[PDB]
Design an enzyme around this catalytic site. Structure first.
Site, mmCIF file in Angstrom:
data_model
loop_
_atom_site.group_PDB
_atom_site.id
_atom_site.type_symbol
_atom_site.label_atom_id
_atom_site.label_comp_id
_atom_site.label_asym_id
_atom_site.label_seq_id
_atom_site.Cartn_x
_atom_site.Cartn_y
_atom_site.Cartn_z
ATOM 1 N N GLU A 1 14.248 -1.579 -0.926
ATOM 2 C CA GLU A 1 13.654 -2.620 -0.105
ATOM 3 C C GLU A 1 14.472 -3.896 -0.135
ATOM 4 N N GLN B 1 0.835 -1.180 0.000
ATOM 5 C CA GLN B 1 0.000 0.000 0.000
ATOM 6 C C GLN B 1 0.897 1.268 0.000
ATOM 7 N N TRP B 2 1.909 1.242 0.847
ATOM 8 C CA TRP B 2 2.840 2.370 0.984
ATOM 9 C C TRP B 2 3.553 2.682 -0.321
ATOM 10 N N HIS C 1 2.657 5.192 -3.300
ATOM 11 C CA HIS C 1 3.044 6.609 -3.291
ATOM 12 C C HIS C 1 4.273 6.769 -4.163
ATOM 13 N N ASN D 1 9.731 14.041 0.235
ATOM 14 C CA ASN D 1 9.628 15.451 0.617
ATOM 15 C C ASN D 1 8.340 15.768 1.393
ATOM 16 N N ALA D 2 8.300 16.932 2.028
ATOM 17 C CA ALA D 2 7.225 17.257 2.912
ATOM 18 C C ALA D 2 5.864 17.385 2.227
ATOM 19 N N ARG E 1 14.750 -12.136 -3.685
ATOM 20 C CA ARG E 1 15.472 -12.796 -4.737
ATOM 21 C C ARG E 1 16.913 -13.012 -4.281
ATOM 22 N N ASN F 1 0.649 14.474 1.568
ATOM 23 C CA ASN F 1 -0.289 13.657 0.768
ATOM 24 C C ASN F 1 -0.445 12.254 1.381
ATOM 25 N N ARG G 1 -3.298 8.114 4.455
ATOM 26 C CA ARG G 1 -2.975 6.979 5.343
ATOM 27 C C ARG G 1 -3.218 7.246 6.816
HETATM 28 C C1 LIG Z 1 17.369 -6.919 -11.692
HETATM 29 C C2 LIG Z 1 16.651 -5.921 -10.784
HETATM 30 C C3 LIG Z 1 16.891 -6.067 -9.356
HETATM 31 C C4 LIG Z 1 16.215 -5.126 -8.428
HETATM 32 N N1 LIG Z 1 16.505 -5.281 -7.058
HETATM 33 C C5 LIG Z 1 15.861 -4.404 -6.152
HETATM 34 C C6 LIG Z 1 16.032 -4.504 -4.720
HETATM 35 O O1 LIG Z 1 16.756 -5.411 -4.321
HETATM 36 N N2 LIG Z 1 15.359 -3.639 -3.960
HETATM 37 C C7 LIG Z 1 14.567 -2.660 -4.459
HETATM 38 O O2 LIG Z 1 14.004 -1.920 -3.680
HETATM 39 N N3 LIG Z 1 14.356 -2.465 -5.713
HETATM 40 C C8 LIG Z 1 14.954 -3.364 -6.667
HETATM 41 N N4 LIG Z 1 14.765 -3.249 -8.081
HETATM 42 C C9 LIG Z 1 13.835 -2.187 -8.470
HETATM 43 C C10 LIG Z 1 14.602 -0.990 -9.009
HETATM 44 O O3 LIG Z 1 15.357 -0.367 -7.946
HETATM 45 C C11 LIG Z 1 13.657 0.042 -9.659
HETATM 46 O O4 LIG Z 1 12.742 0.474 -8.646
HETATM 47 C C12 LIG Z 1 12.858 -0.482 -10.839
HETATM 48 O O5 LIG Z 1 13.774 -1.101 -11.703
HETATM 49 C C13 LIG Z 1 12.160 0.660 -11.576
HETATM 50 O O6 LIG Z 1 13.140 1.418 -12.270
HETATM 51 P P1 LIG Z 1 13.023 3.006 -12.527
HETATM 52 O O7 LIG Z 1 13.201 3.764 -11.234
HETATM 53 O O8 LIG Z 1 13.978 3.366 -13.618
HETATM 54 O O9 LIG Z 1 11.514 3.173 -13.080
HETATM 55 P P2 LIG Z 1 10.444 4.335 -12.725
HETATM 56 O O10 LIG Z 1 10.186 4.436 -11.244
HETATM 57 O O11 LIG Z 1 9.284 4.077 -13.696
HETATM 58 O O12 LIG Z 1 11.178 5.687 -13.216
HETATM 59 C C14 LIG Z 1 11.470 5.896 -14.604
HETATM 60 C C15 LIG Z 1 12.557 6.928 -14.688
HETATM 61 O O13 LIG Z 1 12.079 8.144 -14.095
HETATM 62 C C16 LIG Z 1 13.130 8.656 -13.276
HETATM 63 N N5 LIG Z 1 12.620 8.768 -11.921
HETATM 64 C C17 LIG Z 1 11.350 8.537 -11.490
HETATM 65 N N6 LIG Z 1 11.219 8.901 -10.204
HETATM 66 C C18 LIG Z 1 12.398 9.448 -9.819
HETATM 67 C C19 LIG Z 1 12.870 10.006 -8.641
HETATM 68 N N7 LIG Z 1 12.073 10.133 -7.589
HETATM 69 N N8 LIG Z 1 14.144 10.450 -8.645
HETATM 70 C C20 LIG Z 1 14.950 10.347 -9.709
HETATM 71 N N9 LIG Z 1 14.558 9.827 -10.893
HETATM 72 C C21 LIG Z 1 13.302 9.348 -10.927
HETATM 73 C C22 LIG Z 1 14.399 7.866 -13.518
HETATM 74 O O14 LIG Z 1 15.064 8.410 -14.655
HETATM 75 C C23 LIG Z 1 13.788 6.552 -13.894
HETATM 76 O O15 LIG Z 1 14.648 5.733 -14.676
HETATM 77 C C24 LIG Z 1 15.322 -4.056 -8.918
HETATM 78 C C25 LIG Z 1 15.107 -4.008 -10.377
HETATM 79 C C26 LIG Z 1 15.742 -4.836 -11.254
HETATM 80 C C27 LIG Z 1 15.453 -4.705 -12.725
HETATM 81 C C1 LIG Z 2 -1.514 31.841 -8.670
HETATM 82 C C2 LIG Z 2 -0.203 31.074 -8.843
HETATM 83 C C3 LIG Z 2 1.010 31.788 -8.470
HETATM 84 C C4 LIG Z 2 2.312 31.091 -8.621
HETATM 85 N N1 LIG Z 2 3.456 31.806 -8.213
HETATM 86 C C5 LIG Z 2 4.711 31.168 -8.361
HETATM 87 C C6 LIG Z 2 5.958 31.822 -8.035
HETATM 88 O O1 LIG Z 2 5.877 32.979 -7.637
HETATM 89 N N2 LIG Z 2 7.082 31.133 -8.235
HETATM 90 C C7 LIG Z 2 7.110 29.855 -8.684
HETATM 91 O O2 LIG Z 2 8.187 29.316 -8.825
HETATM 92 N N3 LIG Z 2 6.065 29.169 -8.988
HETATM 93 C C8 LIG Z 2 4.771 29.797 -8.897
HETATM 94 N N4 LIG Z 2 3.548 29.131 -9.232
HETATM 95 C C9 LIG Z 2 3.737 27.779 -9.763
HETATM 96 C C10 LIG Z 2 3.391 26.746 -8.702
HETATM 97 O O3 LIG Z 2 4.358 26.796 -7.630
HETATM 98 C C11 LIG Z 2 3.334 25.323 -9.295
HETATM 99 O O4 LIG Z 2 4.628 25.040 -9.838
HETATM 100 C C12 LIG Z 2 2.299 25.131 -10.390
HETATM 101 O O5 LIG Z 2 1.088 25.635 -9.892
HETATM 102 C C13 LIG Z 2 2.130 23.651 -10.728
HETATM 103 O O6 LIG Z 2 1.458 23.013 -9.651
HETATM 104 P P1 LIG Z 2 1.713 21.478 -9.223
HETATM 105 O O7 LIG Z 2 3.079 21.324 -8.601
HETATM 106 O O8 LIG Z 2 0.567 21.044 -8.370
HETATM 107 O O9 LIG Z 2 1.639 20.694 -10.633
HETATM 108 P P2 LIG Z 2 2.578 19.480 -11.151
HETATM 109 O O10 LIG Z 2 4.039 19.849 -11.140
HETATM 110 O O11 LIG Z 2 1.905 19.023 -12.453
HETATM 111 O O12 LIG Z 2 2.329 18.318 -10.058
HETATM 112 C C14 LIG Z 2 1.036 17.717 -9.912
HETATM 113 C C15 LIG Z 2 0.979 17.088 -8.550
HETATM 114 O O13 LIG Z 2 2.001 16.085 -8.469
HETATM 115 C C16 LIG Z 2 2.635 16.230 -7.198
HETATM 116 N N5 LIG Z 2 4.048 16.471 -7.434
HETATM 117 C C17 LIG Z 2 4.704 16.462 -8.626
HETATM 118 N N6 LIG Z 2 6.029 16.564 -8.431
HETATM 119 C C18 LIG Z 2 6.240 16.561 -7.092
HETATM 120 C C19 LIG Z 2 7.366 16.627 -6.288
HETATM 121 N N7 LIG Z 2 8.578 16.662 -6.826
HETATM 122 N N8 LIG Z 2 7.166 16.601 -4.954
HETATM 123 C C20 LIG Z 2 5.948 16.543 -4.401
HETATM 124 N N9 LIG Z 2 4.806 16.465 -5.119
HETATM 125 C C21 LIG Z 2 4.957 16.512 -6.454
HETATM 126 C C22 LIG Z 2 1.857 17.212 -6.346
HETATM 127 O O14 LIG Z 2 0.796 16.514 -5.701
HETATM 128 C C23 LIG Z 2 1.286 18.065 -7.437
HETATM 129 O O15 LIG Z 2 0.107 18.758 -7.051
HETATM 130 C C24 LIG Z 2 2.400 29.707 -9.129
HETATM 131 C C25 LIG Z 2 1.124 29.076 -9.519
HETATM 132 C C26 LIG Z 2 -0.088 29.680 -9.358
HETATM 133 C C27 LIG Z 2 -1.332 28.950 -9.787
HETATM 134 O O1 LIG Z 3 14.080 -7.998 -9.611
HETATM 135 C C1 LIG Z 3 13.594 -7.256 -8.732
HETATM 136 C C2 LIG Z 3 13.938 -7.405 -7.386
HETATM 137 C C3 LIG Z 3 13.334 -6.518 -6.497
HETATM 138 N N1 LIG Z 3 12.431 -5.593 -6.888
HETATM 139 C C4 LIG Z 3 11.767 -4.692 -5.934
HETATM 140 C C5 LIG Z 3 10.324 -5.114 -5.703
HETATM 141 C C6 LIG Z 3 10.101 -5.071 -4.202
HETATM 142 O O2 LIG Z 3 9.621 -3.764 -3.826
HETATM 143 C C7 LIG Z 3 11.491 -5.287 -3.631
HETATM 144 C C8 LIG Z 3 11.799 -6.738 -3.224
HETATM 145 O O3 LIG Z 3 11.440 -7.557 -4.330
HETATM 146 P P1 LIG Z 3 11.838 -9.107 -4.414
HETATM 147 O O4 LIG Z 3 13.349 -9.191 -4.522
HETATM 148 O O5 LIG Z 3 11.430 -9.708 -3.084
HETATM 149 O O6 LIG Z 3 11.088 -9.704 -5.595
HETATM 150 O O7 LIG Z 3 12.383 -4.813 -4.653
HETATM 151 C C9 LIG Z 3 12.131 -5.434 -8.228
HETATM 152 O O8 LIG Z 3 11.329 -4.544 -8.582
HETATM 153 N N2 LIG Z 3 12.711 -6.292 -9.080
#
Ligand SMILES: Cc1cc2nc3c(=O)[nH]c(=O)nc-3n(C[C@H](O)[C@H](O)[C@H](O)COP(=O)(O)OP(=O)(O)OC[C@H]3O[C@@H](n4cnc5c(N)ncnc54)[C@H](O)[C@@H]3O)c2cc1C
Ligand SMILES: Cc1cc2nc3c(=O)[nH]c(=O)nc-3n(C[C@H](O)[C@H](O)[C@H](O)COP(=O)(O)OP(=O)(O)OC[C@H]3O[C@@H](n4cnc5c(N)ncnc54)[C@H](O)[C@@H]3O)c2cc1C
Ligand SMILES: O=c1ccn([C@H]2C[C@H](O)[C@@H](COP(=O)(O)O)O2)c(=O)[nH]1
Ligand SMILES: Cc1cc2nc3c(=O)[nH]c(=O)nc-3n(C[C@H](O)[C@H](O)[C@H](O)COP(=O)(O)OP(=O)(O)OC[C@H]3O[C@@H](n4cnc5c(N)ncnc54)[C@H](O)[C@@H]3O)c2cc1C
Ligand SMILES: Cc1cc2nc3c(=O)[nH]c(=O)nc-3n(C[C@H](O)[C@H](O)[C@H](O)COP(=O)(O)OP(=O)(O)OC[C@H]3O[C@@H](n4cnc5c(N)ncnc54)[C@H](O)[C@@H]3O)c2cc1C
Ligand SMILES: Nc1nc2c(c(=O)[nH]1)N1CN(c3ccc(C(=O)N[C@@H](CCC(=O)O)C(=O)O)cc3)C[C@H]1CN2
Ligand SMILES: Nc1nc2c(c(=O)[nH]1)N1CN(c3ccc(C(=O)N[C@@H](CCC(=O)O)C(=O)O)cc3)C[C@H]1CN2
Ligand SMILES: Nc1nc2c(c(=O)[nH]1)N1CN(c3ccc(C(=O)N[C@@H](CCC(=O)O)C(=O)O)cc3)C[C@H]1CN2
Ligand SMILES: Nc1nc2c(c(=O)[nH]1)N1CN(c3ccc(C(=O)N[C@@H](CCC(=O)O)C(=O)O)cc3)C[C@H]1CN2
Ligand SMILES: O=c1ccn([C@H]2C[C@H](O)[C@@H](COP(=O)(O)O)O2)c(=O)[nH]1
Ligand SMILES: O=c1ccn([C@H]2C[C@H](O)[C@@H](COP(=O)(O)O)O2)c(=O)[nH]1
Ligand SMILES: O=c1ccn([C@H]2C[C@H](O)[C@@H](COP(=O)(O)O)O2)c(=O)[nH]1
Ligand SMILES: [Cl-]
Ligand SMILES: [Cl-]
Ligand SMILES: [Cl-]
Ligand SMILES: [Cl-]
Lengths: 213, 213, 213, 213
Positions: free
Chosen positions: D84, D73-74, D77, D161-162, D88, D167, D172
């Site tokens: 984790e 469930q967690w 997000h 992040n906060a 495997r 959210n 939750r």
């Molecule tokens: C062989 C294998 C072994 C694995 N073993 C483990 C394990 O032991 N434990 C475990 O927890 N997970 C494991 N994983 C899961 C792995 O860490 C990734 O969560 C999973 O492969 C999804 O990849 P992704 O983050 O590129 O995809 P997505 O989450 O779909 O993201 C797509 C792309 O968006 C970007 N992105 C999205 N969110 C962020 C973010 N918050 N910050 C920066 N970039 C972002 C990156 O460019 C990313 O490549 C494993 C995966 C594989 C394939």
């Molecule tokens: C009236 C008004 C005044 C504004 N003034 C300013 C300003 O002075 N300076 C300025 O820089 N910007 C300004 N903005 C831009 C504003 O800060 C947002 O960047 C913009 O409204 C997009 O909103 P969003 O982040 O919800 O949308 P998106 O970036 O599309 O994100 C959609 C939703 O995804 C989530 N989300 C996506 N990325 C993250 C993340 N990394 N972390 C946490 N949650 C995430 C949140 O739930 C978010 O609501 C202003 C906007 C409005 C409407």
């Molecule tokens: O090949 C892998 C191994 C791990 N995980 C992610 C899924 C779970 O959140 C956690 C543990 O997965 P298992 O190794 O137990 O399948 O890491 C993957 O996505 N792919």
């Protein structure tokens, strides 16, 4: 398009937006801009240079039936949308992934692969029996289900764009991924290829990082 | 569907995946599950409770022509996909947003609103003349364009799902947003309503946070 | 750490969470698990195999002063957080990026590079004069600013994790990126290297896709 | 800060970047801009108006031990980072969540709550015994683990992040969420409150959507 996976799983394409030309258009809206030769070259150009944002304008929705341990790995792909059958809300069906004896090929085991298969079936049957006993006694579903094993089948809808799909294929259509999810990735690849042949072939030639496709 | 905005802008729907029933399905794949009455109630239920993930399975692509200061605000919406005309790559067109004199209604000014309009046209014409002089002298486009003002029109493709679109409408179809982007948001809302009427009406009734729609 | 960029720009590190060991820990919480040799090898292993999620547990906040055309490109990196000075809310300062004559090295021009420099200064001065005239006449700031050019300096805070930072460096610390943002990327790289030396060196050796670092 | 949850779980804060003033700064870099009274009012202003981007500049890393059904469930997000423990790669520990008999308060059951508790312990013991038998016979870990139930404990690092944390708390820390994850959310809230008291109190007063805090 629907494809059977494992013993009881599937991958089905529910809907799709766009095609190879969707990426070509979106990219052209950059140059303020042809024909099949030039559009195919542009796709290859984008792929070759990692300029993958235009492929985000191609979007798929799939319906997937997979065991929970597969879904746990799949749902780690955050750049996508999911909705999944709930064990809090629904009575869960008696459907488990039982590996075939061939699943253990390459591994020396001190009990026969057919007996491993039976031991897995036996424990899953006992777990389901306990689940149903708890449910029928009035235990809430959300608590009763905690005894069910990770090979329980679940189902979900997955909406994913082509760039995020290519990332999924890099990671999951690859020998390092668990064999079970590899099989789902091969199905996803077959559908992607059918719907976006120029993008898919350019992906394989220039950007795909795995070792199976 | 295409809608003119401001003096030279537009919003056009290029493609769409799904409809109101796409959200109902995706949500049902949770309960392992009707008719128009029940499906519409489910949409309202989801919207009322903030259970908005099912709406991510409805996706739109728009083609938008807007001034750069509008696009700067729009591109802050990160949960979406964009590709935009490039000033590094292309010669930029002589097309600027010139406010109508009505844009200043409510504001006491010490020069007439028609003269504000002329002063904006005059400076934009001078900036474009400098841009073209630099380009024709052999200055690279990516440097030449830095003299161009923020009211220059640009164009982009935008692919966005219905949940992220509802967030955009909350923020941009609202009196706190700059009037110019409000006008684009009103157009986006009109198209969303046409394509997803049950979702849109449920959005307005239960979840929409703005004060214009 | 603060670094001057261009004629009036800067990049400053405001805060940081974690270090190279943050990625090693997070990754170990997978194996239910050493020393500098082994931890450094793990970092290289992750980088070599594209297993980059552990680097998301290292986070930076920067304060950046850059021209709007640079910020437009930078803000395309969606996997990050931004807050930027507003032209709707604030009187914007007279501060513009004026290229040095060396910026045109390699380009044959039919007016001298020093005269290109003067022509850019002249138009920016005229645009600012119009802006201030409109502001002082009672035109709302959000409308007055539309005459200001893309070389106006702006400022923003940027919070970004190390994986998304590595993506930014692949794309922006590279000859294909506009020279101006390259200079900011070189500064970001210098700070990343100082804070995360094992990650940075492993990045350069195994994963970095650009041609400048 | 570490907090025990359920029978064998915990939530621990590993690291944090920033504080309430981080959001105030980031937001101010908009107005080109005080004291505790004014900074606290700004936080309330942002929260009241849904202007939540400034809170993205406050970041937490937690270490969490929770049962798999809670982690499933967690991990929904998506706007966060996870790593984790892997089944495997690692031998999984004999540690399961066994509900207390009080977990069934409010439910009429046709077997005593203490007997439900025993039935859950018995099946989990049998499943683990099968798991270990398969492992000790040479079955690969990644296959052996599929017989293990959803109440198995797992561990993960979570960087969030906060804004995304708020959210998570909306969803939750709420009566509609499963009781088990509610307990983890209450712990996350206690840590957030300790680290960001002005943000937390403004959140509760103005933006928090749940019914428990
Ligand atoms: C062989 C294998 C072994 C694995 N073993 C483990 C394990 O032991 N434990 C475990 O927890 N997970 C494991 N994983 C899961 C792995 O860490 C990734 O969560 C999973 O492969 C999804 O990849 P992704 O983050 O590129 O995809 P997505 O989450 O779909 O993201 C797509 C792309 O968006 C970007 N992105 C999205 N969110 C962020 C973010 N918050 N910050 C920066 N970039 C972002 C990156 O460019 C990313 O490549 C494993 C995966 C594989 C394939
Ligand atoms: C009236 C008004 C005044 C504004 N003034 C300013 C300003 O002075 N300076 C300025 O820089 N910007 C300004 N903005 C831009 C504003 O800060 C947002 O960047 C913009 O409204 C997009 O909103 P969003 O982040 O919800 O949308 P998106 O970036 O599309 O994100 C959609 C939703 O995804 C989530 N989300 C996506 N990325 C993250 C993340 N990394 N972390 C946490 N949650 C995430 C949140 O739930 C978010 O609501 C202003 C906007 C409005 C409407
Ligand atoms: O090949 C892998 C191994 C791990 N995980 C992610 C899924 C779970 O959140 C956690 C543990 O997965 P298992 O190794 O137990 O399948 O890491 C993957 O996505 N792919
Ligand atoms: C030389 C150069 C020329 C460019 N020319 C143009 C141009 O002409 N027009 C133009 O519009 N843009 C242009 N760009 C911008 C470019 O298209 C990208 O927007 C920018 O490089 C950011 O890259 P990113 O998407 O990888 O980064 P981020 O947006 O930070 O994303 C990081 C990673 O997360 C993933 N990701 C995040 N969101 C999604 C999503 N919604 N779907 C799938 N994956 C996602 C991807 O793995 C991505 O690599 C140009 C960039 C460069 C470097
Ligand atoms: C009581 C309850 C019952 C639930 N029942 C089910 C169920 O039966 N089945 C099921 O599958 N799930 C279920 N969920 C999970 C739920 O659908 C969400 O996945 C989960 O609550 C995370 O919410 P989120 O998307 O807001 O968070 P995140 O994924 O962290 O996203 C944070 C914010 O970023 C934005 N965002 C991120 N990614 C996107 C995107 N791709 N498109 C648009 N916006 C985006 C949204 O503004 C979002 O609020 C349930 C949750 C709760 C609390
Ligand atoms: N990282 C990166 N991302 C990018 C690009 C890029 O160069 N690098 N660009 C490639 N672009 C095009 C558009 C049209 C043509 C063509 O008509 N010839 C060629 C390229 C569009 C843009 C998309 N995003
Ligand atoms: N935050 C949150 N998110 C959620 C949900 C939720 O309750 N809260 N759920 C609502 N769900 C459904 C599915 C079917 C029916 C119906 O058939 N009656 C009703 C509700 C699906 C799921 C989607 N995501
Ligand atoms: N794509 C992909 N992503 C991944 C991984 C992976 O293999 N592939 N994994 C590498 N993992 C570790 C953890 C500890 C050790 C070590 O102790 N030796 C080695 C590797 C962790 C996990 C992180 N994410
Ligand atoms: N949706 C939305 N998002 C926003 C804002 C907004 O108004 N709406 N803005 C509120 N802003 C500030 C900055 C400083 C002060 C102050 O000094 N008084 C007050 C507000 C910053 C900006 C952040 N993002
Ligand atoms: O209503 C607003 C005001 C600001 N911004 C974002 C866009 C820019 O990145 C930055 C400054 O925008 P302006 O205030 O100058 O339009 O903040 C918006 O998205 N919407
Ligand atoms: O090198 C580039 C070229 C373009 N863009 C993005 C930023 C703008 O949204 C749009 C047009 O940028 P310019 O080419 O005009 O700089 O594409 C970049 O991010 N980097
Ligand atoms: O309260 C809930 C119910 C469901 N889900 C998500 C998690 C799983 O991906 C899927 C099914 O979860 P369960 O209902 O079986 O816990 O939906 C949640 O995140 N929270
Ligand atoms: Cl059944
Ligand atoms: Cl023209
Ligand atoms: Cl000044
Ligand atoms: Cl043990």
């Amino acid at each position: 398009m629907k494809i059977d996976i494992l013993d009881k799983g599937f991958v089905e394409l529910v809907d799709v937006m766009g095609n190879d030309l969707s990426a070509v258009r979106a990219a052209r809206v950059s140059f303020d801009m042809k024909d099949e030769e030039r559009d195919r070259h542009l796709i290859e150009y984008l792929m070759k240079h990692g300029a993958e944002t235009p492929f985000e304008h191609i979007v798929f929705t799939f319906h997937v039936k997979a065991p929970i341990f597969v879904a746990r790995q799949w749902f780690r792909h955050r750049i996508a949308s999911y909705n999944e059958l709930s064990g809090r809300y629904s009575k869960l069906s008696y459907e488990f992934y039982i590996p075939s004896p061939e699943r253990l090929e390459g591994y020396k085991t001190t009990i026969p692969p057919e007996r491993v298969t039976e031991k897995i079936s036996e424990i899953v049957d006992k777990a389901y029996r306990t689940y149903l006993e708890l449910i029928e006694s009035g235990v809430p579903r959300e608590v009763a289900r905690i005894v069910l094993p990770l090979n329980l089948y679940t189902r979900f809808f997955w909406t994913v764009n082509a760039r995020s799909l290519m990332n999924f294929l890099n990671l999951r259509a690859d020998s390092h991924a668990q064999w079970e999810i590899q099989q789902y990735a091969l199905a996803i690849a077959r559908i992607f290829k059918e719907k976006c042949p120029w993008t898919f072939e350019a992906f394989l030639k220039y950007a795909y990082k795995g070792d199976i496709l």
